[PDB]
Design a protein around this ligand. Structure first.
Ligand SMILES: CCCCCCCCCCCCCCCCCC(=O)OC[C@H](COP(=O)(O)OCCN)OC(=O)CCCCCCCCCCCCCCCCC
Ligand code: HEC
Ligand code: HEM
Ligand code: HEM
Lengths: 238, 57, 75, 49, 65, 101, 378
């Protein structure tokens, strides 16, 4: 029982002033909508977040009018379903946690909001997880659990979903294994940090401010301490 | 060295003139610096932002 | 403690010149960098030899923790 | 559940090695686990509390 | 439909301490295959050679995408 | 034996560092009420030299510059001047204690 | 004549901020008073905005924090500014205590005692605040350190099922920790002003330790602009950490919601308790461990009553200077042991590091002061 550390990858947002590929955010959301939205939840992100990031306004309204919501009461007031324009989150494929656990073979899947920012490692962990299925050399494998080295315990109740039934992107970008995995890893990076673009914009502006300002404050400090640096004593007794 | 003499004589002799000077400088510098940093952040990627690909879409 | 009843000092003349007419950084790369090399020589004999012993303890602990994490029998 | 080197239970807080019945062997825990009140009923059941 | 993952993974493990650790793995796997149900999992070798191949593919993956 | 101890004392005095700022042994003394009494009982010219050496030391730690090599007050030319005054102060303090006991 | 010397508030402002007789040879280690004060007003202000957008309920506490980070304009900058400002706050605090121990400022008694009370107050405030986001690591660290307070014999059991608000960590525990995480920083501010009061009573201490009553300069416009420079460096470091690396300090185990059944193996608290948490599990005993923690900070209390030197600084006691840097190496070793799991080599060197900690502070520094007492005809 060990910890295999994930490698280091040259990401397109890896540099300290680089941002995400918004086109990759779009096609990674396409990945989440096609294949991944049946076991995993992403209950802290709404469709209205996507109104300026990787879709226009009308397209996200279509993508949120495709799904029923089950809004609350009316005048008589049982409940009723609803298309829903923007005020809806991503709706909960399995309602309860233990209902999700009993639907799978135990081991309910964690939600996909903070996975990139919460696994002792970045999206390299998610990439190596999603791509690193292999051969088990003489281990237990208790009747439903697969082998993947990038996981504590080496026993995952997730069937390997990345290339099995390729999802056929809308743009015509060729669906290999690595490209669809890179897309969903970029989208999960975005779903972890919705502020990454604007925070590195303000980081650039703060770098220019503290490169343009802090030498002047140091100059003014030295200019007001300039007297006592140059003061000179002499000793007069009688 | 003569170029700072009239600068001291017109914008640093008083106090209210100095305050008006740094206020007008703050607004002009705010505009010019926001335009400059926007140009730098567009130039540093040029292929990744939502803006140019969305007007291509 | 107010300002004026601190101590009693005779026999002392102090010269000090105006801040404007003297320069801001007086030969900032002719006294400053031998100054900080002087301060660096006067300290690292008492600064460094704890830290490198810590660094060796750090690397030894990591190395032996992995080598006692891994057993390798043979059968 | 099933961690450590003794096979049994193991506290990850301060490295307490328990055995399979949950008894302290190597750690700063002075006491063992608590045995609750349990009543076996023949429906393959037990009322625990 | 061939992913470039397969291409650069099979390329980068060509002749290397990768291959030395793979043969070390085949040593331990033959060692347990010639042994009646021992403990030796022959798994540490799997971790460190796939660590080696994933570092060398990590240097040379995202260029062709 | 003898000069080995002297070698230790002279080396420690070189490596202390206050000799490099124009100080003597009794310009870096900790102050309680006893040493304030001993400073109060000083003569005048030594007190004026004391405040001048302290003021130069505070200047040369204000710009953090050490004196040139030729003006460092070496060992066995300094004045151990405060010693009898401070000795009589501590003797009188112990005298008050062991008299009122 | 002067409003600055007759108006009753401005007498206080003048005697504390302008006409204060300050020594003239301050190095950069005398910035950390202003740095702790400006960190304090920044943490209070960002915390007040966080407390305007927070709902303490265990069903929706984590969802409320996620709502802050995602939906509110710049609420992510305020949240990360509060957390990284707490870490920079404890950085500046340990620089401040290191200055106060190294340059011999612990010959001032009452300021030192008020300081130690401020140290306990900031530690309790940091712990309650780290509980508040209601995460995995937050929940289990709350359980562990509350049971540390349950280690007190015969009194601690009812005390800890009291401050649990029941028999487990509940809604009441989160709301208690919210109310006291609110009210303790204002007590920190008031005790900071009492700290400042006794320091202005005694007078400051220069780096030499020579009494600088002959060379006082005023506070303004010298140390005002020096502390503006120091606060500008501090704001640079804080904006740098909240704009490029939030990943550098936050524990990634925290971000899963507080499942009361998981208990991950990675169980370490936030790093500025790991110099102290590793002292606990160094001892294979409960009461000995909690008593050794309390006695470590009480050793920081009983620092002055072992000062058997005759010069107050350590600038002129080079062996005590060496043992001070050995003590700093030992504390950073304790932090690294706090960041590691509990097995055999780490257990050995954690025991040895805690024993060398108490042996260096209690014993060897007065022994070195005695050997330079006896070496210099004193
Ligand atoms: C820390 C980084 C290293 C700093 C360093 O090397 O500082 C050197 C300086 C030398 O001091 P000195 O030689 O006496 O003064 C020369 C002035 N002419 O020494 C100094 O400036 C020392 C002043 C700062 C000392 C503390 C720095 C670390 C802060 C954490 C200390 C923790 C103390 C214990 C707290 C818990 C108990
Ligand atoms: C149902 C089958 C799916 C599908 C279609 C996907 N996942 Fe995966 N996933 C599933 C389960 C039951 C679990 C839990 C296994 C366990 O408890 O050990 C997971 C787990 C993950 C994780 C967790 C890794 C970790 O906890 O460190 C991740 C990151 C993950 N799943 C991602 C993921 C993605 C990106 C998917 C779309 C391709 C995806 N899963 C599909 C079940 C299922
Ligand atoms: C009285 C003023 C303060 C208020 C109103 C306040 C309020 C809050 C609130 C509401 C939170 C939870 C929000 C969140 O964590 O995302 C919080 C977290 C926290 N606070 Fe404060 N706080 C105050 C002062 C302080 C001070 C002085 C410190 C110590 C420097 C501090 C340290 C913390 C820490 C460490 C957290 C956890 C941050 C995290 O991990 O996300 N707070 N505070
Ligand atoms: C709550 C956090 C604290 C704050 C805001 C604080 C604030 C200050 C301020 C403003 C000063 C004056 C600045 C200076 O003298 O350099 C000061 C000095 C001092 N503080 Fe603190 N302090 C804090 C914690 C502590 C602690 C924990 C101690 C240790 C017990 C301590 C001991 C001292 C000492 C000894 C001085 C005098 C240093 C000198 O003047 O030479 N402080 N503090």
């Amino acid at each position: 029982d060990l910890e295999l550390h994930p490698p280091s990858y040259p990401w397109s947002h890896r540099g300290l002033l680089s941002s995400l590929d918004h086109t990759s955010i779009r096609r990674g959301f396409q990945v989440y909508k096609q294949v991944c939205s049946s076991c995993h939840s992403m209950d802290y992100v709404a469709y209205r977040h996507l109104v300026g990031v990787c879709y226009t306004e009308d397209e996200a309204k279509a993508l949120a009018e495709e799904v029923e919501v089950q809004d609350g009461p009316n005048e008589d007031g049982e409940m009723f379903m609803r298309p829903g324009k923007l005020s809806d989150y991503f709706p909960k494929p399995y309602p309860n946690p233990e209902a999700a656990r009993a639907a799978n073979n135990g081991a309910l899947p964690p939600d996909l909001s903070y996975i990139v920012r919460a696994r002792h490692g970045g999206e390299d962990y998610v990439f190596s997880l999603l791509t690193g299925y292999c051969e088990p050399p003489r281990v237990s494998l208790r009747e439903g659990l697969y082998f993947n080295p990038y996981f504590p315990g080496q026993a995952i109740g997730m069937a390997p979903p990345i290339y099995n039934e390729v999802l056929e992107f809308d743009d015509g970008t060729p669906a290999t294994m690595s490209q669809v995995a890179k897309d969903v890893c970029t989208f999960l990076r975005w779903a972890a940090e919705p502020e990454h673009d604007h925070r590195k914009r303000m980081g650039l502006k703060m770098l220019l401010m503290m490169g343009l300002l802090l030498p002047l404050v140091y100059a003014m400090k030295r200019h007001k301490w300039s007297v006592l640096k140059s003061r000179k004593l002499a000793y007069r007794p009688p | 060295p003569t170029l700072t003499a009239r600068l001291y004589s017109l914008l640093f002799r008083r106090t209210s003139t100095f305050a008006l000077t740094i206020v007008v400088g703050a607004l002009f510098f705010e505009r010019a610096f926001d335009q400059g940093a926007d140009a730098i952040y567009e130039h540093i990627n040029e292929g990744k932002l939502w803006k140019h690909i969305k007007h291509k879409y | 403690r107010q300002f004026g009843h601190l101590t009693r000092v005779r026999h002392v003349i102090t010269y000090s010149l105006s801040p404007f007419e003297q320069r801001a950084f007086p030969h900032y790369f002719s006294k400053g960098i031998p100054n900080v090399l002087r301060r660096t020589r006067a300290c690292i004999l008492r600064v460094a030899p704890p830290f490198v012993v810590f660094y060796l303890v750090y690397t030894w602990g990591t190395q032996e923790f992995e080598k006692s994490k891994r057993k390798n029998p043979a059968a | 559940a099933n961690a450590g080197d003794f096979g049994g239970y193991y506290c990850p807080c301060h490295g307490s090695h328990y055995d399979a019945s949950g008894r302290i062997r190597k750690g700063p825990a002075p006491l063992n686990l608590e045995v609750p009140s349990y009543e076996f009923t023949s429906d393959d059941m037990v009322i625990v509390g | 439909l061939v992913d470039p993952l397969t291409t650069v993974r099979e390329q980068c493990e060509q002749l290397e301490k990768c291959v030395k650790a793979r043969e070390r793995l085949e040593l331990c796997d033959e060692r347990v295959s010639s042994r009646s149900q021992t403990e030796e999992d022959c798994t540490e070798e799997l971790f460190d050679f796939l660590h080696a191949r994933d570092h060398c593919v990590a240097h040379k993956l995202f260029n062709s995408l | 034996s003898s000069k080995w101890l002297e070698g230790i004392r002279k080396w420690y005095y070189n490596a202390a560092g206050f000799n490099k700022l124009g100080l003597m042994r009794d310009d870096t003394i900790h102050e309680n009420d006893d040493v304030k009494e001993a400073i109060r009982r000083l003569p005048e010219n030594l007190y004026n030299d004391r405040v001048f050496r302290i003021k130069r030391a505070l200047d040369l730690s204000m710009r953090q510059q050490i004196l040139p090599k030729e003006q460092w007050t070496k060992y066995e030319e300094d004045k151990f001047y405060l010693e009898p005054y401070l000795k009589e102060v501590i003797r009188e303090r112990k005298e008050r204690e062991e008299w009122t006991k | 004549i002067n409003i600055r010397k007759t108006h009753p508030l401005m007498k206080i402002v003048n005697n504390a901020f302008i006409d204060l007789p300050a020594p003239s040879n301050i190095s950069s280690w005398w910035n950390f008073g202003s740095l702790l004060g400006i960190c304090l007003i920044l943490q209070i202000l960002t915390g007040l905005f966080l407390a305007m957008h927070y709902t303490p309920d265990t069903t929706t506490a984590f969802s409320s924090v996620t709502h802050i980070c995602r939906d509110v304009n710049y609420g992510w900058i305020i949240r990360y500014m509060h957390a990284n400002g707490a870490s920079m706050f404890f950085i500046c605090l340990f620089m401040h205590v290191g200055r106060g121990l190294y340059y011999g400022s612990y010959t001032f008694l009452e300021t030192w005692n008020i300081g130690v009370i401020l140290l306990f107050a900031t530690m309790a405030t940091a712990f309650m605040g780290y509980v508040l986001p209601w995460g995995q690591m937050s929940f289990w660290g709350a359980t562990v350190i509350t049971n540390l307070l349950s280690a007190i014999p015969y009194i601690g059991t009812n005390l800890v099922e009291w401050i649990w608000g029941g028999f487990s960590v509940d809604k009441a525990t989160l709301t208690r920790f919210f109310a006291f995480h609110f009210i303790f920083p204002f007590i920190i501010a008031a005790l900071a002003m009492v700290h400042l009061l006794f320091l202005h009573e005694t007078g400051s201490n220069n780096p030499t330790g020579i009494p600088s009553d002959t060379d006082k300069i005023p506070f303004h416009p010298y140390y005002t602009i020096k502390d503006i420079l120091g606060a500008i460096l501090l704001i640079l470091i804080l904006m740098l950490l909240v704009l490029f690396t939030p990943d550098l300090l936050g524990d990634p185990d925290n971000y899963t919601p507080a499942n009361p059944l998981n208990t991950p193996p990675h169980i370490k608290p936030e790093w500025y308790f790991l110099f102290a948490y590793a002292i606990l599990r160094s001892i294979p005993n409960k009461l000995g461990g909690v008593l050794a923690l309390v006695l470590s900070i009480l050793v920081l209390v009983i620092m002055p009553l072992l000062h058997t030197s005759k010069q107050r600084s350590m600038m002129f006691r080079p062996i005590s200077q060496c043992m001070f840097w050995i003590l700093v190496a030992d504390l950073l070793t304790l932090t690294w042991i706090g960041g590691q799991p509990v097995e055999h080599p780490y257990i050995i060197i954690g025991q040895l590091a805690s024993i060398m900690y108490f042996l260096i502070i209690l014993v060897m520094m007065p022994v070195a002061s005695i050997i330079e007492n006896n070496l210099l005809k004193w």
